[PDB]
Amino acid sequence: SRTALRDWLTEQLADLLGEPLADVRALADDDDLLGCGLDSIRLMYLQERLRARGSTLDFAQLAQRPCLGAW
């Protein structure tokens, strides 16, 4: 399910950015996370958490299109 996968990214971005999950649910899927206070120090940790989830991606494969929709 795509929305449960969004909820796991919502959990990760709430944890990484220091936000409530509600503030990450306040994004549209296409909203720019570097627009919304993400950076590489966080996006590396996300890339590890994704690889730990089994969801192997390299940093650019996320960071080329920096919104939930592309991820």
Swiss-Prot record:
- Every copy of the Carrier domain together lies at 1-71
Kindly summarize what the UniProt induction comment says about this protein's expression.
Expression of the pchEF operon is strictly dependent on the PchR regulator and is induced by extracellular pyochelin, the end product of the pathway. Repressed by Fur and iron.
O-(pantetheine 4'-phosphoryl)serine-modified residues are: S40
Following inactivation of the gene, the phenotype reported is: Deletion of the gene completely abolishes the formation of both Dha and pyochelin and results in salicylate accumulation.
Sequence similarity: Belongs to the NRP synthetase family.
Its function, per the record, reads: Involved in the biosynthesis of the siderophore pyochelin. Accepts salicylate activated by PchD at the first peptidyl carrier domain (ArCP), and activates and fixes one molecule of cysteine at the second peptidyl carrier domain (PCP1) via a thioester linkage to the phosphopanthetheine moiety. Then catalyzes the condensation reaction between the salicylate bound to the first site and the cysteine bound to the second site, and the cyclization of the cysteine to form the salicyl-thiazolinyl-S-PCP1 intermediate at the second site.
* Free-text note on domains in this protein's UniProt record: Modular protein that contains an aryl carrier protein (ArCP) domain which bears a phosphopantetheinyl arm to attach the activated salicylic acid, a condensation/cyclization domain involved in the cyclization of the cysteine, an adenylation domain which activates the cysteine residue into an aminoacyl-AMP ester and a peptidyl carrier protein (PCP1) domain which bears a phosphopantetheinyl arm to attach the activated cysteine.
- For this entry, the protein name equals Pyochelin synthetase PchE
Organism of origin:
Pseudomonas aeruginosa (strain ATCC 15692 / DSM 22644 / CIP 104116 / JCM 14847 / LMG 12228 / 1C / PRS 101 / PAO1)
